[PDB]
Design a protein around this ligand. Sequence first.
Ligand code: JDC
Ligand code: JDC
Lengths: 447, 448
Amino acid sequence: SPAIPVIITAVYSVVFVVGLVGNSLVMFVIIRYTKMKTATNIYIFNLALADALVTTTMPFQSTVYLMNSWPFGDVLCKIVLSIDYYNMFTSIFTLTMMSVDRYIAVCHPVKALDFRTPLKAKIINICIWLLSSSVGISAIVLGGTKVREDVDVIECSLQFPDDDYSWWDLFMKICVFIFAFVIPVLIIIVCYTLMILRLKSVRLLSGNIFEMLRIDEGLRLKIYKDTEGYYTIGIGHLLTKSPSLNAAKSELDKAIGRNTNGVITKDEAEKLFNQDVDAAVRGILRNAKLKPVYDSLDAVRRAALINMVFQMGETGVAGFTNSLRMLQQKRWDEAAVNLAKSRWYNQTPNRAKRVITTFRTGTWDAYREKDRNLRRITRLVLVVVAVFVVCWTPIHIFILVEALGSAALSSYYFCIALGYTNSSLNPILYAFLDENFKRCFRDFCFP
Amino acid sequence: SPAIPVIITAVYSVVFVVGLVGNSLVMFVIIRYTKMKTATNIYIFNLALADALVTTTMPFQSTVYLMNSWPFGDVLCKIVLSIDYYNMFTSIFTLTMMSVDRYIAVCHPVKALDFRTPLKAKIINICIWLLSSSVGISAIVLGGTKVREDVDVIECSLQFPDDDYSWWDLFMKICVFIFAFVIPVLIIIVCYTLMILRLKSVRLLSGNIFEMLRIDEGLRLKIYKDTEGYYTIGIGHLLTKSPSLNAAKSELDKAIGRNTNGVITKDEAEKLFNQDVDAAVRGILRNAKLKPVYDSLDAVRRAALINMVFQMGETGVAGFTNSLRMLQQKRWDEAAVNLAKSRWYNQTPNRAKRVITTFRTGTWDAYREKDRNLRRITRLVLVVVAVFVVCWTPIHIFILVEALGSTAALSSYYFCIALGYTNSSLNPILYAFLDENFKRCFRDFCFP
Ligand SMILES: CC(C)[C@@H](CN1CC[C@@](C)(c2cccc(O)c2)[C@@H](C)C1)NC(=O)[C@H]1Cc2ccc(O)cc2CN1
Ligand SMILES: CC(C)[C@@H](CN1CC[C@@](C)(c2cccc(O)c2)[C@@H](C)C1)NC(=O)[C@H]1Cc2ccc(O)cc2CN1
């Protein structure tokens, strides 16, 4: 059909421009602005660099395809080959190191922002370029031109010993498939499967029940009066309801084991708290309605349940039958919507929300403000990798299959088209999945 | 040479993308945003619509270039051609009206209120497309592919009755040249000369001695030490040369009429400034060397003379006897040359050059921000017209020359149409850099 060339020409151009103008824009935006040089970005720079270099080979790819020969002579042949191979290795290694970076990021939100973290990244980038020189440089040496057959066409390619070109070619191409694909991709996959585990682990262990109730119930090292006027101390520990400070001091002294005079140490208050928690838990497991719900909840949502018993007691909580069964069916919002309608919510809105937020999200976000950036950045890296693999897999299997086996040139060019498309996609991905890039691109391209 | 193909592919690509994407973006922005509905922008839309269409033909051209023939058959041939012509006539007629529209904004402000509206511009746009349809539709009619002889190449082109073919082509090419270039360009030239003349004419009514000295002398409402260290206030008003600050305060407290404590209102600053100016003018009229010169000078150059006295004093200025004589003979350049030799020019070059330029030009040009002469939007249009002409001149003359009168020049034709294609992708970029609004709306669209 007459449309094919037109469509291909158009697509080809868009990819080249976005791929070349896109990545070159990224590289610059970073190098110039110290404001944004982060472990993740320094890698992206390396990525964009490889992706920009490779995009400049498009006008060679096509012009070669049109003439069906290599006009560019030896030098250019040796160069674009070393690019071809540098891009291939450089970008995959970078993405693996990015994943690894994200991996150690989930347990270190503090070190992520440091003097070294960005610097280490710079160094690694180089190490990647040195390792890639392995095949990058050998591409410069082996790269060469030859006049094939009777045809007046010229071929640009790596030149191995004649006849045994087959073995060395097969040898190299397999090595490529091992090191530039199999290893990194699996390493990456392992990197993420484990990362989601560390995240699950961090979402439970990022907060304890002590930090929770200390925010809702407060902490006092001296006897004080409840909101209802009752004498209490520490974290929501009712001493007595009777209006005698001497009784509150009496009851308190039995609680600690010494003569307190209405004054307890922080440590003592923790011991008291831990006893009160245990007491509440024993009460939950003794209660017919709460036990099954408690057993069925994750530790974070359990904390919320304990939190409620602390405030209104075991009996008070069991009356939320409609919301309890919903939790036991893991219908988190349905539960959250019902609890908000309760009187408990009306008379203590702020706290109630924090508890409901816990039941709904299954996290400590209500109590322990989490940085949304770590998750946003991590999903940036994930997607970029995801897209890469999708785009570079067709080409890696196609080169492997042709070599291992004994028309179909269309498939090659399609596979080639993806790898090129990947390079024009990344720049876009940076812009939509990282609000800092979007602000920098904006402020730079439209001031 | 091996590098040429690479360079062209790359440049071809960017031209295409920016051209198709850039003009698509313009049309969209103009359509969705109320503040983008303006006479000028309605033309811009029409223009970008033409630039977008012609850009869709780039991939066809590269194809026909490589295969050397037309694979797309007549239907696409007749279409791709009408676009070739539509684009040509539509775009140029728009820029003309765009220029005319601006000419009205400047030389017919009163009628401009009623004439310049998105609606009237839409109507005019439509006409341009109906007008262009005379060659756009006939292109559809005369468009067709004929298999060439002596070769197996298909040819997409206008098909006039053979035997008379050579002359019809020429007939049309001449007419296309007159109507799609010479005439619009002339009108545009007339428009833009009438504008600058009236802008120049108005700009010299928007200046005066006061605004002039406010810039040269500056303004500070609290007491400060001048360039030579003497206490000063307001607009270059020297209080005293005594370094007491209390005498400065005592000098200010007097003649203002209150105890200022070293701080005056902006109104009090003018009161003083007006007094200093009146004093300078009274100074000029009492001095026999300056009076006759002052009298013979026009308003603007009179200000230039008052400025000088204001700075270095009546007597000081009257020592420029050679320059003064030349100024009373209306020989400005010769006088400006002398004044530049003065110590006044060496000590305070920036100011002196501005004052001298005023005596030279007789205008306030020395007291503006460079090319603030034309407005943000008028400047835009004038740049877009310029680039267009520069870009479309080569192809127009080329087509015409060959038509009157050589197989290696094929490379020229291709360079000439590269300028045309390139101009289509340039506009979108110019809109962004030369219009704060486009720049603003592109931003929101691309990077929310
Ligand atoms: C966009 C990406 C996927 C292109 C970039 N590249 C750059 C160099 C290139 C333009 C070229 C270079 C030399 C001669 C020629 O005909 C074509 C042409 C191979 C395309 N990369 C490749 O084609 C890679 C894919 C690959 C996969 C496995 C393996 O063992 C070796 C290779 C080497 N070529
Ligand atoms: C970008 C602009 C300047 C191109 C766009 N255009 C679009 C159509 C075109 C691709 C084409 C159309 C049909 C066959 C063919 O080989 C080529 C090819 C003429 C290029 N337009 C032209 O070159 C104009 C230039 C011109 C100047 C004087 C005149 O009497 C007639 C014409 C007609 N074509």
